[PDB]
Coordinates of C-alpha atoms in Angstrom, one line a residue:
Chain A
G1 CA -50.6 -24.7 13.3
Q2 CA -47.5 -23.1 13.2
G3 CA -46.1 -24.8 15.4
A4 CA -46.6 -27.5 12.9
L5 CA -45.9 -24.9 10.0
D6 CA -42.5 -24.1 11.9
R7 CA -41.4 -27.3 12.2
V8 CA -41.4 -28.5 8.4
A9 CA -40.3 -25.5 7.5
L10 CA -37.9 -25.8 10.0
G11 CA -36.9 -28.9 9.8
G12 CA -36.1 -28.2 5.9
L13 CA -33.8 -25.3 6.5
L14 CA -31.9 -28.7 8.9
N15 CA -32.2 -30.7 6.5
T16 CA -30.5 -29.1 3.8
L17 CA -28.6 -26.9 5.6
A18 CA -27.3 -31.1 7.0
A19 CA -27.2 -32.1 3.4
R20 CA -24.7 -29.4 2.3
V21 CA -22.4 -30.0 4.8
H22 CA -22.7 -33.9 4.1
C23 CA -23.8 -35.1 7.6
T24 CA -26.9 -36.4 6.4
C25 CA -22.8 -33.9 13.5
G26 CA -26.3 -34.3 11.7
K27 CA -28.1 -35.4 14.4
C28 CA -26.7 -33.1 16.7
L29 CA -28.7 -30.9 14.7
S30 CA -32.9 -31.0 15.2
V31 CA -35.9 -28.6 15.3
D32 CA -36.2 -27.9 18.5
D33 CA -32.2 -26.3 18.4
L34 CA -34.1 -25.1 16.1
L35 CA -36.6 -23.1 18.0
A36 CA -35.0 -22.7 21.3
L37 CA -33.0 -20.0 19.2
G38 CA -35.8 -17.5 19.7
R39 CA -40.1 -16.4 19.6
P40 CA -40.6 -15.2 15.9
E41 CA -41.8 -12.4 16.8
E42 CA -38.6 -10.9 18.6
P43 CA -37.3 -7.6 16.1
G44 CA -32.9 -10.0 15.4
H45 CA -35.0 -13.3 15.3
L46 CA -34.3 -13.7 11.8
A47 CA -31.1 -12.3 11.6
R48 CA -30.1 -15.0 14.7
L49 CA -31.8 -17.7 13.1
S50 CA -29.2 -17.3 9.7
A51 CA -26.0 -16.0 11.9
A52 CA -26.9 -19.7 13.9
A53 CA -27.2 -20.9 10.5
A54 CA -24.0 -19.9 8.8
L55 CA -22.3 -20.9 11.4
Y56 CA -23.3 -24.5 11.4
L57 CA -22.3 -23.7 7.6
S58 CA -19.2 -22.8 8.7
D59 CA -18.0 -24.7 11.7
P60 CA -20.3 -28.8 11.9
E61 CA -18.8 -29.5 14.8
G62 CA -17.8 -26.8 16.8
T63 CA -21.4 -25.7 16.3
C64 CA -23.4 -28.8 17.7
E65 CA -20.6 -28.4 20.2
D66 CA -21.8 -25.2 20.6
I67 CA -25.5 -26.2 20.8
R68 CA -24.9 -29.4 23.3
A69 CA -22.7 -26.5 25.5
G70 CA -26.5 -24.4 24.7
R71 CA -24.9 -21.5 23.5
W72 CA -25.4 -21.6 20.0
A73 CA -27.6 -18.1 20.1
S74 CA -24.7 -16.3 22.1
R75 CA -22.5 -17.8 19.5
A76 CA -24.8 -16.4 17.2
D77 CA -25.7 -13.2 17.9
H78 CA -21.4 -13.0 18.6
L79 CA -21.3 -13.5 14.6
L80 CA -22.9 -11.2 13.8
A81 CA -21.6 -8.3 16.0
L82 CA -17.9 -9.1 14.6
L83 CA -19.7 -8.4 10.8
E84 CA -22.1 -5.4 12.8
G85 CA -18.6 -3.6 13.5
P86 CA -16.9 -0.4 11.1
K87 CA -15.6 -1.9 8.2
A88 CA -16.5 -5.6 9.2
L89 CA -19.2 -7.0 6.8
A90 CA -17.7 -7.4 3.8
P91 CA -14.2 -8.8 4.6
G92 CA -16.3 -11.1 6.9
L93 CA -18.4 -12.1 5.0
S94 CA -15.3 -13.6 2.7
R95 CA -13.7 -15.2 5.4
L96 CA -17.2 -16.7 6.1
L97 CA -18.0 -18.2 2.7
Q98 CA -14.6 -19.7 2.3
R99 CA -15.0 -21.8 4.9
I100 CA -19.1 -22.8 4.2
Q101 CA -16.8 -23.3 0.9
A102 CA -14.7 -25.7 2.7
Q103 CA -17.7 -27.6 4.2
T104 CA -19.8 -27.4 1.0
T105 CA -17.2 -29.6 -0.3
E106 CA -20.9 -22.5 -14.3
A107 CA -21.1 -19.3 -12.5
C108 CA -21.9 -19.0 -8.9
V109 CA -22.5 -16.6 -6.2
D110 CA -20.1 -14.2 -4.6
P111 CA -20.0 -12.4 -1.6
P112 CA -20.5 -8.3 -3.6
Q113 CA -23.9 -9.9 -4.9
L114 CA -25.2 -11.3 -1.5
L115 CA -24.4 -7.8 -0.7
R116 CA -26.3 -6.3 -3.6
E117 CA -28.7 -8.6 -3.3
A118 CA -30.0 -7.2 0.4
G119 CA -29.9 -3.7 1.1
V120 CA -31.4 -0.6 -0.6
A121 CA -30.8 1.7 -3.5
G122 CA -27.1 0.6 -3.9
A123 CA -26.3 0.3 -0.4
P124 CA -25.1 -2.8 0.5
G125 CA -26.9 -5.5 3.5
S126 CA -26.0 -5.0 7.4
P127 CA -25.6 -8.0 8.8
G128 CA -28.6 -10.0 9.4
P129 CA -30.6 -9.6 6.1
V130 CA -27.2 -10.5 4.0
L131 CA -27.1 -13.3 6.3
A132 CA -30.2 -14.3 5.5
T133 CA -29.8 -14.0 2.1
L134 CA -26.7 -16.3 2.0
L135 CA -29.7 -19.2 3.8
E136 CA -31.7 -18.5 1.3
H137 CA -28.8 -19.5 -1.1
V138 CA -27.8 -22.1 0.1
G139 CA -31.9 -23.8 0.2
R140 CA -32.1 -23.0 -4.1
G141 CA -28.5 -24.5 -3.4
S142 CA -26.5 -21.7 -4.9
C143 CA -22.8 -23.3 -5.8
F144 CA -20.7 -19.7 -4.0
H145 CA -17.5 -18.2 -5.2
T146 CA -14.9 -15.8 -3.2
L147 CA -12.0 -13.9 -4.0
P148 CA -9.5 -12.4 -0.5
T149 CA -9.8 -10.0 1.4
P150 CA -7.9 -6.7 1.0
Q151 CA -6.2 -7.8 4.5
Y152 CA -5.2 -11.3 3.3
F153 CA -2.8 -10.0 0.6
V154 CA -0.3 -8.2 3.7
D155 CA -1.5 -11.1 6.1
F156 CA 0.3 -13.5 3.7
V157 CA 3.2 -11.8 3.9
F158 CA 4.1 -11.7 8.3
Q159 CA 2.3 -15.4 8.1
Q160 CA 4.8 -16.7 5.2
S161 CA 8.1 -14.6 6.3
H162 CA 10.3 -16.8 8.9
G163 CA 11.0 -14.4 12.1
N164 CA 10.7 -14.4 15.8
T165 CA 9.6 -10.6 15.8
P166 CA 6.1 -10.0 15.7
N167 CA 7.1 -6.8 12.9
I168 CA 9.2 -7.5 9.9
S169 CA 13.3 -6.7 10.7
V170 CA 15.0 -4.7 8.4
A171 CA 16.9 -7.9 7.9
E172 CA 13.0 -10.0 6.9
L173 CA 12.1 -6.6 4.7
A174 CA 15.5 -7.1 2.5
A175 CA 15.1 -10.2 2.1
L176 CA 12.6 -9.7 0.8
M177 CA 13.5 -6.9 -1.6
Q178 CA 15.4 -9.8 -2.6
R179 CA 12.9 -12.6 -3.8
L180 CA 11.3 -9.8 -5.8
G181 CA 14.4 -8.5 -7.6
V182 CA 15.1 -5.5 -5.4
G183 CA 17.9 -3.3 -3.2
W184 CA 14.2 10.6 -10.1
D185 CA 13.7 7.7 -11.9
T186 CA 16.9 6.0 -12.1
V187 CA 18.2 5.1 -8.0
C188 CA 17.4 1.7 -6.5
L189 CA 17.2 1.8 -2.9
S190 CA 18.0 -0.5 -0.2
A191 CA 15.4 -2.0 2.1
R192 CA 17.2 0.5 4.7
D193 CA 16.2 3.1 1.8
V194 CA 12.6 2.0 1.1
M195 CA 12.0 2.6 5.7
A196 CA 13.6 5.9 5.6
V197 CA 11.0 6.9 3.2
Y198 CA 8.2 6.4 5.3
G199 CA 9.6 7.6 8.1
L200 CA 10.1 3.9 9.3
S201 CA 12.2 3.3 12.5
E202 CA 14.1 0.1 12.1
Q203 CA 14.2 -0.5 16.0
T204 CA 10.0 -0.6 15.8
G205 CA 10.5 -2.5 12.0
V206 CA 7.5 -2.7 9.5
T207 CA 4.3 -3.8 10.5
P208 CA 1.2 -4.4 8.1
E209 CA 0.0 -0.8 8.5
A210 CA 3.6 0.3 7.1
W211 CA 3.9 -2.3 4.7
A212 CA 1.2 -1.4 3.1
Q213 CA 2.8 2.4 3.1
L214 CA 5.7 0.3 0.8
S215 CA 4.4 -1.6 -1.3
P216 CA 3.9 0.9 -4.4
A217 CA 7.9 1.2 -4.0
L218 CA 7.9 -1.7 -3.8
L219 CA 6.8 -2.3 -7.8
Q220 CA 8.1 1.0 -8.8
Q221 CA 12.1 -0.4 -7.8
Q222 CA 10.2 -3.7 -9.8
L223 CA 9.0 -1.4 -12.6
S224 CA 11.6 0.7 -12.8
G225 CA 14.1 -1.7 -14.0
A226 CA 16.7 0.8 -11.5
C227 CA 18.5 -3.0 -9.8
Chain B
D1 CA 34.5 41.7 1.4
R2 CA 35.5 40.2 -2.6
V3 CA 38.0 38.8 -0.7
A4 CA 35.7 36.9 0.8
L5 CA 33.8 36.3 -2.9
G6 CA 37.4 35.2 -3.7
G7 CA 37.3 32.1 -1.7
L8 CA 33.7 31.5 -2.6
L9 CA 34.6 31.3 -6.2
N10 CA 37.4 29.1 -5.6
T11 CA 35.6 26.2 -4.2
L12 CA 32.1 26.7 -5.7
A13 CA 34.7 25.7 -8.9
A14 CA 36.5 23.2 -7.5
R15 CA 33.6 21.2 -6.3
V16 CA 32.8 20.9 -9.8
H17 CA 36.1 20.7 -11.6
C18 CA 36.1 23.5 -13.4
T19 CA 39.3 25.0 -12.1
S20 CA 41.6 24.8 -14.6
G21 CA 38.6 25.7 -17.3
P22 CA 36.6 27.5 -19.4
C23 CA 33.3 27.2 -16.9
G24 CA 34.7 28.1 -13.6
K25 CA 36.6 31.2 -16.1
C26 CA 32.7 32.9 -16.5
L27 CA 32.4 32.7 -12.6
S28 CA 33.7 36.1 -11.4
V29 CA 34.0 38.5 -8.7
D30 CA 32.1 41.0 -9.6
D31 CA 29.3 39.0 -11.4
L32 CA 29.0 37.9 -7.8
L33 CA 28.3 41.3 -6.9
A34 CA 26.3 41.8 -9.1
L35 CA 23.6 39.8 -7.4
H36 CA 21.3 39.6 -0.2
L37 CA 22.9 35.8 2.0
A38 CA 20.1 34.0 -0.2
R39 CA 20.3 34.8 -3.0
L40 CA 23.8 34.5 -3.1
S41 CA 23.5 30.8 -1.2
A42 CA 21.1 29.9 -3.8
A43 CA 22.8 31.8 -7.1
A44 CA 25.5 29.5 -6.3
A45 CA 23.2 26.8 -5.5
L46 CA 22.1 26.1 -9.0
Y47 CA 25.7 27.3 -10.1
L48 CA 27.1 24.1 -8.4
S49 CA 23.8 22.4 -10.1
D50 CA 23.9 23.5 -13.5
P51 CA 27.5 25.3 -13.7
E52 CA 26.9 25.3 -17.8
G53 CA 23.4 26.3 -17.4
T54 CA 24.5 28.7 -15.4
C55 CA 27.5 30.7 -17.0
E56 CA 24.2 30.6 -19.9
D57 CA 22.0 32.5 -17.3
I58 CA 25.5 35.1 -15.9
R59 CA 26.1 36.1 -19.8
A60 CA 22.9 36.9 -20.4
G61 CA 23.1 38.5 -16.4
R62 CA 19.6 36.5 -15.3
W63 CA 21.2 35.0 -13.4
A64 CA 19.8 36.7 -10.1
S65 CA 15.9 35.7 -11.0
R66 CA 16.8 32.5 -11.4
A67 CA 18.3 32.7 -7.8
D68 CA 14.7 34.1 -6.7
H69 CA 12.9 31.6 -8.5
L70 CA 14.8 29.4 -6.9
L71 CA 14.2 31.0 -3.0
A72 CA 10.7 30.8 -4.7
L73 CA 10.7 27.0 -5.3
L74 CA 11.5 26.4 -1.7
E75 CA 9.9 29.2 0.3
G76 CA 6.7 27.0 -0.2
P77 CA 4.7 24.9 2.6
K78 CA 5.8 21.6 2.0
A79 CA 8.1 22.6 -0.3
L80 CA 12.1 23.3 0.6
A81 CA 12.6 18.9 2.5
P82 CA 11.8 17.8 -1.0
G83 CA 12.8 20.6 -3.4
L84 CA 16.3 20.1 -1.2
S85 CA 16.9 16.8 -2.2
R86 CA 16.2 17.3 -5.8
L87 CA 19.0 20.2 -5.8
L88 CA 20.7 18.0 -3.8
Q89 CA 20.6 15.4 -6.3
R90 CA 21.3 17.3 -8.6
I91 CA 24.3 19.2 -6.9
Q92 CA 26.1 15.2 -6.4
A93 CA 25.9 15.0 -10.0
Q94 CA 28.2 17.5 -11.3
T95 CA 30.5 17.6 -7.8
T96 CA 31.8 13.6 -6.9
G97 CA 28.2 10.8 -7.3
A98 CA 28.8 8.4 6.2
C99 CA 26.8 11.3 3.9
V100 CA 24.6 14.9 4.9
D101 CA 20.5 14.1 3.7
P102 CA 18.2 17.7 4.1
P103 CA 16.6 16.1 7.8
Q104 CA 20.8 17.4 8.8
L105 CA 20.4 20.3 6.7
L106 CA 17.7 21.3 8.1
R107 CA 18.6 20.6 12.0
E108 CA 22.0 22.1 11.9
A109 CA 20.7 25.8 9.9
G110 CA 18.2 26.7 12.0
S111 CA 14.2 29.4 6.0
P112 CA 15.7 28.6 2.4
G113 CA 18.3 30.8 2.9
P114 CA 19.6 30.3 5.6
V115 CA 19.9 26.2 4.4
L116 CA 21.1 26.7 1.3
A117 CA 24.5 28.5 2.9
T118 CA 24.8 25.6 5.6
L119 CA 24.4 23.2 1.8
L120 CA 26.6 25.4 1.1
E121 CA 29.1 25.2 3.7
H122 CA 28.7 21.4 3.9
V123 CA 30.0 21.5 -0.3
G124 CA 33.0 23.0 0.7
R125 CA 33.6 20.2 3.9
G126 CA 33.3 17.7 0.7
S127 CA 30.2 16.1 2.5
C128 CA 28.8 13.8 0.5
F129 CA 24.6 13.8 0.3
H130 CA 22.0 11.0 1.2
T131 CA 18.4 12.4 -0.5
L132 CA 14.4 10.3 -0.6
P133 CA 12.5 11.4 -3.4
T134 CA 8.7 10.8 -2.0
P135 CA 5.9 8.5 -0.8
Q136 CA 4.3 10.1 -3.7
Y137 CA 6.5 10.0 -6.1
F138 CA 6.6 6.1 -6.2
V139 CA 2.5 6.0 -6.9
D140 CA 3.2 8.9 -8.8
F141 CA 5.9 7.0 -11.2
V142 CA 3.9 4.4 -11.9
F143 CA 1.3 6.3 -14.0
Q144 CA 4.1 7.4 -16.8
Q145 CA 5.9 4.3 -16.9
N146 CA -2.7 8.3 -21.8
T147 CA -5.5 7.8 -20.2
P148 CA -6.2 9.8 -16.6
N149 CA -6.4 6.4 -14.8
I150 CA -5.0 2.9 -15.6
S151 CA -6.7 0.8 -17.8
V152 CA -8.0 -2.2 -16.4
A153 CA -5.8 -3.1 -19.6
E154 CA -3.4 -1.2 -18.6
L155 CA -3.2 -3.0 -15.7
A156 CA -2.9 -5.8 -16.6
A157 CA -0.3 -5.2 -18.6
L158 CA 1.5 -4.2 -16.1
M159 CA 0.6 -7.5 -14.3
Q160 CA 2.4 -9.6 -17.0
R161 CA 6.0 -7.7 -16.3
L162 CA 5.2 -8.5 -13.4
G163 CA 4.5 -12.1 -13.8
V164 CA 0.9 -12.0 -12.2
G165 CA -2.9 -12.2 -13.9
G166 CA -1.6 -15.3 -14.9
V167 CA -0.6 -13.4 -18.1
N168 CA 1.7 -27.3 -2.1
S169 CA 0.2 -27.8 0.8
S170 CA -1.4 -24.5 1.9
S171 CA -2.0 -22.8 5.3
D172 CA -5.1 -20.7 3.1
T173 CA -7.3 -21.6 0.4
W174 CA -6.8 -18.5 -0.8
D175 CA -2.8 -19.2 -0.9
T176 CA -3.5 -20.7 -4.4
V177 CA -6.0 -18.8 -6.4
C178 CA -4.2 -16.1 -8.6
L179 CA -6.1 -12.9 -9.6
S180 CA -6.9 -12.1 -12.8
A181 CA -6.3 -7.8 -13.3
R182 CA -10.3 -7.9 -13.0
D183 CA -10.8 -9.8 -10.2
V184 CA -7.4 -7.5 -7.9
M185 CA -10.1 -4.7 -8.9
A186 CA -13.2 -6.9 -7.5
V187 CA -11.1 -7.6 -4.6
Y188 CA -10.7 -3.6 -4.0
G189 CA -14.0 -2.7 -5.1
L190 CA -12.5 -0.7 -7.3
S191 CA -15.3 0.0 -11.0
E192 CA -13.6 -1.3 -14.2
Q193 CA -15.3 1.6 -16.1
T194 CA -13.8 5.0 -13.3
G195 CA -9.7 2.8 -14.1
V196 CA -7.1 2.7 -11.3
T197 CA -6.1 5.5 -9.0
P198 CA -3.7 7.3 -7.6
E199 CA -5.0 6.1 -4.8
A200 CA -6.2 2.6 -6.0
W201 CA -3.1 2.1 -7.6
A202 CA -2.0 2.6 -3.8
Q203 CA -4.9 0.5 -2.4
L204 CA -4.1 -2.5 -4.6
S205 CA 0.0 -2.1 -3.9
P206 CA 0.1 -5.0 -1.7
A207 CA -2.0 -8.2 -3.7
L208 CA 0.1 -7.5 -6.5
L209 CA 3.4 -7.8 -4.4
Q210 CA 1.1 -11.0 -2.8
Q211 CA 0.2 -12.8 -5.9
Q212 CA 4.0 -12.7 -6.8
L213 CA 6.4 -13.6 -3.4
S214 CA 3.0 -16.7 -3.6
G215 CA 4.4 -18.0 -6.7
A216 CA 0.2 -18.8 -8.2
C217 CA 1.0 -17.4 -11.3

C-alpha cells in the first residue's frame, strides 16, 4: 500500500538527487535510508527529509559517510537548527545553494524567490517549508542562482589580507587604504585617523564589525578625491 | 582689568597675524569691555575663527550676540565635541595650519565656557589642533557629493566612479561575481522603488570596497 507508494515516490526523489549531482556516491543512497529518517506522521518530518536531501545535494560524498555512520537524521536536524537561528536563514540558504550549484555542475531561481514561495502574506518562509520548496524545485529541474551574502563582503577582506593577527592591524588597514588610493569635505585621513573617528583602539585593531563601520569613510575618502 | 584684557587682545591679534594690520586695530579693549567669562571666551574664539568677519560684527555692535550664539551652538546635548572640532578647524586655518584634540580640551577643562577658555589657553601656548569628522559625516557627505534617497541610477554612477558595477584560482566562487547596482541592492534586501537611504548606504559600503579589492570588475 503506502509502503509501496512511498517507495516509488521516495525512490524517484532519490533518483533525481543522484542525477543532479551526477552520481547516477549514488549507490550509498537508498530508499530505506530515506525511510529511516522518520515516520511520515511526525510533525517536522517533511523538514527533516527536505534538509536531509539538501545536505545530500550539498555534500554527496560527505553525506554517504554520514549515512553509513547512521547519523543522517542528526546532521539533518543540525542544518534545520543552523537555519532556524535568529537572522540565519537567508544567508544560510545562500551558502547552501552555492554549494548545491557547485555540485549541480536563461532565468533561474534564487533564495529570495524560495523565501517568498514558501511562507505567507509577504513574510519569508521558515526553514522546513523553504527547504521543501527547494526540493520541489530540484524535482522540476530548475537551475539556481545565488548572490553573495552581506557577511561575505567583510569576510572576504579578512581572508585576502595577509596577517598573523585575527583582527586587521593599523598597518594592514593602511596597506588597504593605499590599494584604494587613500591614506570639512577636503581633509585626507590617515589609517590612524580613520580608527580615531570610530573610536577604535590601535592595540585592539579592526574587527569585522569595525571594518563594516569604517567602510563608509573609506568610500567617502575615495569619492572626495582628497587623497 | 584692562591690563589683562589688553594682553588677551595682543595674543588674539598675534596668533591670527594681525599685529601690525587693520584687523588687529579693530579689536580694542573697550570692545572687550562692552561684552561673562563664557561670553568673553566665545567672543575671542570667534575672533580667532574669523578676524575680518568679527571686526564687521564688532563695528555693528553685534559681537556679544554672535558670541552668545556660539555658546548656544555648543551648549546642546551631543553638540559640544563636534562643534568644537568644527571651530578648531577654522581656527587652525587662520592661525598656523604633536597635537591637541577636543577630548583633551574637554578633560583639561573640567561646560562650553570653561572649555573655550581652555582652547584659548592653548592658542596662547601655540599648540596645534587635530580635529576629526563624525561617523555621520561620512555617510551624510556622499548624499551631497536630488531625490531624498540615492537612485539605483545614482548608485550605479557612484559604482562607476569607483571602477565597479561592470560599467584566477578562487577560494570562493563568489570571488568572481561582479555585481550590478541592482545586484548590490538585492544583496541587502533593498527596494529599488525606495532607493538607497543613508542607513542603507552604510550597510552596502563593505560590498563596494570588496568589489574593488576583489578585482572582479
